[PDB]
Design an enzyme around this catalytic site. Structure first.
Site, PDB file in Angstrom:
ATOM      1  CB  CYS A   1      -0.603   0.105   4.499  1.00 39.52           C
ATOM      2  SG  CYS A   1      -1.273   1.679   5.143  1.00 39.52           S
TER       3      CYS A   1
ATOM      4  CB  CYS B   1       1.229   3.353   5.079  1.00 39.42           C
ATOM      5  SG  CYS B   1       0.240   2.421   6.261  1.00 39.42           S
TER       6      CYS B   1
END
EC number: 1.8.-.-
Lengths: 56, 54, 49, 116, 950, 49
Positions: free
Chosen positions: D42, D39
């Protein structure tokens, strides 16, 4: 405009340069703490205690 | 060709040199001199005059 | 010498022939040139005027 | 380590390790991060939790759960996107509050004290 | 494990990883080689239990060790066994072998209180090397050479169908026809099992190939001998001639000795292991000497009594103090501390020195890409003999340089990590491309062509045949060349010197970040250790000029700061806190930044207004014209601390027959006052021997620190100089644009812009076309835009990979943004972008041709801080002028000539005929060789011969 | 060839009156303007001149 966005180059002219960013390697351990952690070097407390054991 | 007035020299008492540290001051003595060098003064008269930060 | 003599540290001895043969010998460096006094070495700048 | 400080304070937990933590008695607000290594956002989020964990040394426990390992568990937790946190109150009667997206670090600490 | 795969690896990792290997593996390996001790057989037996070795943390801290001029080192303790067979009783003791020096994380040792680094050496790898040879008439004889860990030179050349020479030395010319059995081998049992035998019709010095040699000897000769065996085999010698014959028929190719696959890199791990082996080699002689004395005196000694700390401690001190590779750490600036530990030395003990320095080794090889920087020649002892490692370069397992590449896996599993570290051997066999994938056509992208390297050759191939990609920007460059913005617009040779100049930059009193950079200044500051880095997380409880208090995990740490500490090159190292009270800090983040570092970035210079125009010849060639603003503004003012130390004889407060002109500042003992101004010639330490300390010429300023050590006493006195910029100082940009300062002008007569600001420095525009470094032109214009827009740029090199004229597009767009937001139309002129009409500060009229202006980053160099003989050629020039009396004057009283120089002062104070001492000395040397050199002057008047005495 | 990226010269002062004579009358720049190699001027304006 450039195809590569200039915002990548832009940096504020007052920045502490966070060394924990994604582009920085892991923090370098103190050499006489990586050896201690890996039990390669015993602390002086261990040394004197072991040296005191043979004093008997 | 425009004269200005500003601090020329500062005299401390208990420090050995302008590169030491004074206990209780967050700045080094050299930091103080640069701060003094930065202040701006106005005066229409010539001559060397005294001032105090006691 | 077929077996030139060397010191304990295996240094080839500098014979009298060597002290007058090479540049470090007292024939070229000492004679063709001197450590001349009244000499001053410093950085130079452009004097355009 | 005893001699070298750990570089990261946010501890990764399994779905089960998180369960007993919630079932067990917690005296401090619990912050649960759901993330994935692939991600993009993230990466930026993970740095803030480390910074937040320094602010709340023991006043708040911050843990993270990898959605690659616990994809079915995150789905049951009503997780719709990856940069998602869960602030679990120490009081059982309170309601856990879920935030989605790169919330500012200032909001995170505001949630810890105002709502927990 | 994936250290350099994603991020830039730590610049000191090679030093860091080597030392850990030495501690983890290099100790027991040498200790296991320590043999038993016994004469023949008596009431004596000494041995070391290797498995029980221990290391103790040093008592003294690093700061204590340097302050006391000690050696920061760990103590090695091994349990030793002794038995007296007459008593047949075992005596056991934990003995102290000696001290093993410890390096810090920055990659530097301190031995006797001086920071020393161990640079890396590159040597020929052990193995077989087939290379042709030519003789006085030309033979084209193929030669096979075997190299061992001892630098063996077992050459094996083929004289066609005739004998196969196996000369160990030049005088050991010997065949192998009768050396079939040789060492322990046999007759023609296996000699006839390969090819044809019609041609046939020392113990330890160079006899083992080692771990590396066994791999290489099997790699080339395709031998089934397992790598576990180390000793050479006659099969290997037999196979050497097998592949040798194939070269005659055309099969195979000759080895290239300059290929990095044939080279091995030995780091501090290898050298520290070797010195440990020598110490144990000297240690076994000590115990053998001790037992002989013990038997001769017949005493019962403990195992400690049979050993001493001398063999271990002395060899390392000798190693660090004498070995050419162990160099003193260069602490001129944070850049020098880092780049010093990443040097490659082709020369050295067993290396190719300046004598065996055939210029092929001084050349770039295709295997150097990503491992050794082509730019950074770094001419030190000799040109091309001291290289530097690339930023992403890593040390492989077999002493090899590995550079990461991105593997283009074609549906081959998940591929896990697609970043591969490639040794130079396997680098040649991959199609590595550096181009981009931004080309599309009516076809597909896979068939788009892209330049690539294959078999040490550049070629254009389609994307589907490409195996690897070089994705990292700082892949092929060292640290010095990676700090140059827009380096791709500079000639490579200028970039070579730019790295040299940045290692001479002086940390200024107040540092300043560069407006235009490359983004590598972050890593350089991080790895240099000059800034204070938190080793623990938590909040900041208290910060001040002297220390920072950090609390985290109910533990508090008092980080000390460095204030006005002299470096090895007389440069101030001052740390300023950059964390306010109460702020939370993550482990590894910055707390305080040292000299030449601002906000965690390397800051070696300043940003100043600059115009590239000729100005009345004061910027002729490389001359630089500056304004007084740089002087009274303290823009380039640097602090320099000089240490004066005398080793002792009594130190007296005052020496007789002296006045108060010198003895004014001497104290009760005789030292200067801490904080007293001192001029040249003033006495610093008043000593009397049955000898003083005066301030030399140039030395001046304020005394900062004084040390009394005391056993002869040692006095060290430090003087700080506020060395502002001045005429004759060296300033330089990062693009190799060096410059001397010839003129300092008032601000009112320097050329000024259309906003009225006078420029700070004026450069010669003629420098760019000849030196061909257009990067400064880009940096200059972008620096002006950055200062007006209040931005800092960090541009990775080779930005043209995105698009054509990418740097031009970036700079012009930012210039226009500055010209628009700040409403300064002179910043971006559509008629001539990057240039502007500036006005003469003297007459006030404009220069008709517009001038390029901006804010480049300009450094101040060290030459004026760090620092005669007439050569033989000047004699030729003087003779050409025919100045016979001047030429004589050089080789006379203005030289080593005592008689004439004695009175030449006095002849010129009030108002030859002898041979010079050099000639007289020459006669004695020939007189010592049984040669009589006589100088006669046969007179021209009465032919009277007189002998000139010499 | 005095580049201004760094250069240091050695300066010597003639002492004897004979040396001062030939320094002024033989080695001064105003009497050595032609290179003996071919007879071409040496102090030709260059660079920004």
């Amino acid at each position: 405009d450039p195809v590569y966005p200039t915002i990548n180059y832009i940096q504020a002219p007052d920045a502490v340069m966070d060394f924990r960013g994604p582009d920085f390697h892991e923090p370098t351990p103190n050499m006489l703490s990586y050896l201690k952690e890996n039990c390669k070097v015993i602390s002086r407390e261990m040394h004197e205690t072991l040296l005191a054991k043979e004093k008997t | 060709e425009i004269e200005g007035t500003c601090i020329t020299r500062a005299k401390f008492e208990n420090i050995p040199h302008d590169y030491s540290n004074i206990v209780g001051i967050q700045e080094s003595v050299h930091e103080i001199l640069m701060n003094l060098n930065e202040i701006v003064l106005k005066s229409n008269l010539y001559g060397t005059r005294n001032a105090l930060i006691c | 010498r077929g077996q030139p003599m060397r010191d304990g540290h295996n240094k080839v001895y500098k014979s009298f022939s060597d002290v007058i043969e090479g540049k470090e010998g007292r024939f070229r460096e000492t004679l063709l040139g001197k450590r001349v006094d009244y000499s001053g070495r410093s950085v130079i700048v452009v004097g355009p005027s | 380590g005893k001699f070298v400080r750990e570089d990261y304070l946010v501890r990764k937990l399994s779905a089960q390790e998180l369960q007993d933590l919630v079932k067990g008695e917690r005296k401090v607000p619990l912050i649960v991060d759901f993330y994935a290594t692939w991600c993009g956002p993230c990466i930026l989020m993970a740095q803030e939790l480390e910074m937040l964990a320094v602010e709340y040394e023991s006043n708040a426990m911050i843990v993270k759960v990898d959605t690659d390992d616990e994809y079915e568990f995150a789905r049951d937790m009503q997780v719709r996107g990856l940069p998602t946190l869960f602030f679990i109150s120490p009081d059982p009667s309170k309601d856990a509050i879920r935030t989605e997206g790169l919330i500012p670090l200032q909001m995170m600490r505001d949630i810890i004290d105002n709502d927990m | 494990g994936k250290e350099g795969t994603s991020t830039i690896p730590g610049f000191n990792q090679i030093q860091f990883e080597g030392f850990y290997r030495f501690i983890d593996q290099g100790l027991i390996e040498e200790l296991s080689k320590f043999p038993k001790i016994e004469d023949i057989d008596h009431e004596i037996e000494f041995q070391l239990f290797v498995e029980t070795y221990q290391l103790v943390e040093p008592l003294i801290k690093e700061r204590d060790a340097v302050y006391e001029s000690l050696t920061y080192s760990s103590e090695l303790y091994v349990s030793a066994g002794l038995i007296w067979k007459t008593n047949r009783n075992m005596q056991e003791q934990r003995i102290f072998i000696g001290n093993i020096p410890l390096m810090n994380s920055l990659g530097t040792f301190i031995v006797n209180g001086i920071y020393r680094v161990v640079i890396n050496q590159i040597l020929q790898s052990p193995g077989i090397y087939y290379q042709s040879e030519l003789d006085h008439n030309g033979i084209s004889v193929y030669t096979g050479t075997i190299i061992s860990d001892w630098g063996g030179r077992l050459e094996l050349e083929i004289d066609k169908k005739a004998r196969i020479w196996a000369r160990v030395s030049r005088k050991q010319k010997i065949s192998i026809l009768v050396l079939s059995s040789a060492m322990g081998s046999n007759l023609r049992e296996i000699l006839e099992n390969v090819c044809y035998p019609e041609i046939f019709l020392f113990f330890h010095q160079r006899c083992e190939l080692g771990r590396i040699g066994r791999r290489n000897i099997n790699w080339r000769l395709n031998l089934n001998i397992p790598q576990n065996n180390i000793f050479l085999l006659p099969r290997d010698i037999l196979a050497a001639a097998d592949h040798l014959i194939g070269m005659k028929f055309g099969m195979g190719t000759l080895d290239d000795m300059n290929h990095l696959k044939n080279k091995r890199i030995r780091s501090v791990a290898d050298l520290l292991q070797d010195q440990l082996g020598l110490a144990l080699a000297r240690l076994e002689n000590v115990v053998k000497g001790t037992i002989g004395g013990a038997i001769r005196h017949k005493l019962i000694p403990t195992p400690q009594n049979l050993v001493t700390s001398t063999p271990l401690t002395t060899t390392y001190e000798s190693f660090f103090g004498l070995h050419p590779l162990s160099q003193v750490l260069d602490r001129t600036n944070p850049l020098t501390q880092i780049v010093h530990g990443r040097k490659l030395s082709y020369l050295g003990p067993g290396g190719l020195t300046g004598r065996t320095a055939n210029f092929r080794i001084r050349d770039i090889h295709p295997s150097h890409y990503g491992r050794i920087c082509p730019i950074d020649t770094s001419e030190g002892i000799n040109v091309g003999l001291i290289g530097s490692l690339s930023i992403h370069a890593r040390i492989g397992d077999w002493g090899s340089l590995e550079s990461p590449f991105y593997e283009l896996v074609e549906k081959s599993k998940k591929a896990q990590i697609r970043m591969l570290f490639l040794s130079p051997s396997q680098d040649e066999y991959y199609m590595i491309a550096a181009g981009n994938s931004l080309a599309l056509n009516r076809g597909i992208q896979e068939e788009q062509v892209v330049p690539a390297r294959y078999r040490q050759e550049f070629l254009t191939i389609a994307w589907e045949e490409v195996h690897l990609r070089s994705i990292f920007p700082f892949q092929y460059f060292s640290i010095g060349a990676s700090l140059i913005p827009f380096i791709e617009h500079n000639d490579a040779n200028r970039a070579l010197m730019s790295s040299n100049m940045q290692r001479q930059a002086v940390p200024l009193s107040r540092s300043e970040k560069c407006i235009v950079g490359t983004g590598l200044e972050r890593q350089v500051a991080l790895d240099s250790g000059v800034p204070a880095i938190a080793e623990h997380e938590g909040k900041i409880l208290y910060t001040d000029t002297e220390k920072i208090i950090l609390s985290g995990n109910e533990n508090t740490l008092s980080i000390p700061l460095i204030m006005y500490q002299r470096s090895n090159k007389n440069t101030c190292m001052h740390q300023k806190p950059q964390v306010r009270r109460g702020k939370c800090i993550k482990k590894g983040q910055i707390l305080a930044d040292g000299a030449a570092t601002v906000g965690g970035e390397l800051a070696l210079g300043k940003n100043i207004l600059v115009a590239y125009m000729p100005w009345e010849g004061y910027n002729f060639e490389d001359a630089v014209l500056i304004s007084e603003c740089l002087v009274y503004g303290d823009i380039y003012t640097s602090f320099h601390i000089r240490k004066y130390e005398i080793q002792t004889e009594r130190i007296t407060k005052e020496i007789p027959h002296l006045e108060g002109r010198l003895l004014r500042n001497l104290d009760k003992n005789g030292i200067v006052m801490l904080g007293s101004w001192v001029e040249t010639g003033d006495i610093l330490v008043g000593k009397l021997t049955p000898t003083c300390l005066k301030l030399p010429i140039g030395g001046r300023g304020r005394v900062i620190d004084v040390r009394w050590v005391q056993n002869p006493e040692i006095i060290r006195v430090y003087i700080s100089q506020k060395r502002e910029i001045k005429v004759g100082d060296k300033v330089a940009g990062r693009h190799g644009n060096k410059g001397i300062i010839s003129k300092i002008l008032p601000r009112q007569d320097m050329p000024y812009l259309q906003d009225g600001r006078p420029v700070d420095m004026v450069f010669n525009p003629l420098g760019v076309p000849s030196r061909m470094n257009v990067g400064q032109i880009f940096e200059c214009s972008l620096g002006l835009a950055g200062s007006l827009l209040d931005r800092h740029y960090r541009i990775a090199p080779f930005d043209e990979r995105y698009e054509q004229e990418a740097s031009r597009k970036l700079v012009f767009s930012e210039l226009y943004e500055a010209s628009k937001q700040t409403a300064n139309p002179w910043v971006f002129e559509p008629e001539y972008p990057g240039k502007s009409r500036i006005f003469d500060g003297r007459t006030g009229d404009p220069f008709e041709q517009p001038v390029i202006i901006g804010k480049p980053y300009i450094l101040k160099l060290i030459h004026q801080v760090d620092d005669q003989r007439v050569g033989e050629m000047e004699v030729w020039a003087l003779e050409g002028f025919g100045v016979a009396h001047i030429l004589q004057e050089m080789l006379t009283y203005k030289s080593d000539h005592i008689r004439a120089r004695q009175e030449v002062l006095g002849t010129t104070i009030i108002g030859p005929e002898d041979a010079p001492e050099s000639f007289r000395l020459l006669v004695r040397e020939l007189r010592s060789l049984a040669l009589e050199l006589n100088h006669f002057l046969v007179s021209e008047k009465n032919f009277q011969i007189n002998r000139k005495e010499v | 060839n005095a580049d201004f990226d760094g250069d240091q010269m050695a300066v010597h002062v003639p002492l004897s009156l004979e040396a001062q004579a030939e320094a002024r009358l033989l080695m001064f720049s105003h009497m050595n303007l032609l290179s003996p190699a071919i007879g071409d001027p040496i102090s030709v304006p260059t660079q920004d001149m």
